[PDB]
Amino acid sequence: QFIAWL
C-alpha cells in the first residue's frame, strides 16, 4: 500500500 498524511 501507499499511504500519505500531509
Q: How was this structure determined?
A: X-ray
Residue with cell 500500500: 1
Give CA–CA dist 1/4, Å, rounded: 10
Give CA–CA dist 5/3, Å, rounded: 7
Give CA–CA dist 1/6, Å, rounded: 16
Residue with cell 500531509: 6
Tally of CB atoms within 10 A around 3: 4
DSSP 1-6: ------
Find how far residue 6's CA is from the centre of its chain. Answer: 8
Find how far residue 1's CA is from the centre of its chain. Answer: 8
Phi-psi sector, 5: left (phi>0), alpha (psi -120 to 50), beta: beta
